[PDB]
């Protein structure tokens, strides 16, 4: 039921996945799509302090995609853009739709 196409774009370097983080969660997980922002809603099991939400977010998606993931926008924001290097949009969508 979730459509990720409005939260992704494929660039020269890989795929930029646009997310909005909800911290203080009991489990890091994808919960839905913010259609007004074009972002994947991700609960993150970390407080919003010490870059701890960034660390958990990148661990989660590196494991999911099997590729390196860096934060390219929003290091100190809830609205973060994640560059997944060396991957196609088709691959990213397949992993998100699991
Ligand atoms: Na590009
Ligand atoms: Na994962």
UniProtKB/Swiss-Prot annotation:
Q: Which is one Pfam family of this protein?
A: DUF167
Q: Which Gene3D superfamilies match?
A: YggU-like
Q: Which SUPFAM superfamilies match?
A: YggU-like (SSF69786)
Cellular component GO terms, alphabetical:
cytoplasm
Lineage top rank: taxon: Archaea
Q: Which InterPro entries match?
A: DUF167, YggU-like_sf
**Family recorded in the similarity comment:** Belongs to the UPF0235 family.
The record's listing under NCBIfam families reads: DUF167 family protein (TIGR00251)
- What PANTHER family does the record tag this protein with? UPF0235 PROTEIN C15ORF40 (PTHR13420:SF7)
Q: Which protein are we looking at?
A: UPF0235 protein PF1765
- Look up and give the organism this protein is from: Pyrococcus furiosus (strain ATCC 43587 / DSM 3638 / JCM 8422 / Vc1)
């Amino acid at each position: 039921n979730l459509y990720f196409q409005g939260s992704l774009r494929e660039t020269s370097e890989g795929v930029i996945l646009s997310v909005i983080v909800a911290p203080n969660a009991r489990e890091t997980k994808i919960v839905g799509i913010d259609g007004t922002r074009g972002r994947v809603k991700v609960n993150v099991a970390a407080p919003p302090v010490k870059g701890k939400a960034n660390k958990e977010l990148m661990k989660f998606f590196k494991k999911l995609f099997g590729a390196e993931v860096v934060i390219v926008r929003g290091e100190t924001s809830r609205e973060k853009d994640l560059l997944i290097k060396g991957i196609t949009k088709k691959e990213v969508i397949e992993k998100l739709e699991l």
